[PDB]
């Protein structure tokens, strides 16, 4: 996979076939790659957050092996216990690795409901959401700076998003595409009626976030939210 070298920027750390980019004093992006027919290596991004004496993870890598490597990198570079992980959609591949490491995992109740038919291991805990989209705090105990928001159905019915309190960063998962994207990608499980409003709701939930991190593109400005919503407008 020679795609990794083209993708790396100054300051990125390669660890096996994983790449880590520091985004803030206590936040890193993790990136893994999967060879997909007719496209070669495709990037998937998540977050690693150092919160005092512990680490919080958002999303697995594509695979269990890659996810184990993320945990290896955390041990080496941060050396704090990983307390919990939040997974933002059912599509994840590395749940077993998190569980093997004794990390408590959380996902939208709907993600957990969809997991078996997707061939995914469910998270151990289900998040539920108020009618305003905000996670019910009893379902997300001790989440530290992670602010979890369900913006409505978009790329998938279960997609959730995560703001990192006290930073410029919000994570849009698969809902948000970068501001240069040519399409919204795979819409097979999308709600094409509500997608545009859901993308805008994510923006309104984290209005101060200037760095938008996403599942399949490098971090971008809020132009990513605007562009995603406008592409989504066209599907209605």
Swiss-Prot record:
It comes from Klebsiella pneumoniae. Its main location: periplasm. Zn(2+) 1 binds at residues 89, 91, 155. Belongs to the metallo-beta-lactamase superfamily. Class-B beta-lactamase family. SUPFAM superfamilies: Metallo-hydrolase/oxidoreductase. The gene is blaNDM-1. It comes from the Bacteria. Confers resistance to the different beta-lactams antibiotics (penicillin, cephalosporin and carbapenem) via the hydrolysis of the beta-lactam ring. Does not confer resistance to the polymixin colistin or the fluoroquinolone ciprofloxacin. It catalyses: a beta-lactam + H2O = a substituted beta-amino acid. This is Metallo-beta-lactamase type 2.
């Amino acid at each position: 996979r020679p795609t990794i070298g083209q993708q790396m920027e100054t300051g990125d750390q390669r660890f096996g076939d994983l790449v880590f980019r520091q985004l803030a004093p206590n936040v890193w992006q993790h990136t893994s790659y999967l060879d997909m027919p007719g496209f070669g290596a495709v990037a998937s991004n998540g977050l690693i957050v150092r919160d005092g004496g512990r680490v919080l993870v958002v999303d697995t890598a594509w695979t269990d092996d890659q996810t184990a490597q993320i945990l290896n990198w955390i041990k080496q570079e941060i050396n704090l216990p990983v307390a919990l992980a939040v997974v933002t959609h059912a599509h994840m591949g590395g749940m077993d690795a998190l569980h093997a490491a004794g990390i408590a995992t959380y996902a939208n109740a709907l993600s957990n409901q969809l997991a078996p038919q997707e061939g995914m291991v469910a998270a151990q805990h289900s998040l539920t959401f108020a009618a305003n989209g905000w996670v019910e705090p009893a379902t997300a105990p001790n989440f530290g700076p992670l602010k979890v928001f369900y913006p409505g159905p978009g790329h998938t019915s279960d997609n959730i998003t995560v703001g990192i309190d006290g930073t410029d960063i919000a994570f849009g998962g698969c809902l948000i595409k970068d501001s240069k994207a040519k399409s919204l990608g795979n819409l097979g499980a999308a709600d094409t009626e509500h997608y545009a409003a859901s993308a805008r709701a994510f923006g309104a939930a984290f209005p101060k976030a200037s760095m938008i991190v996403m599942s399949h593109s490098a971090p971008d400005s809020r132009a990513a939210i605007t562009h995603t919503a406008r592409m989504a407008d066209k599907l209605r």
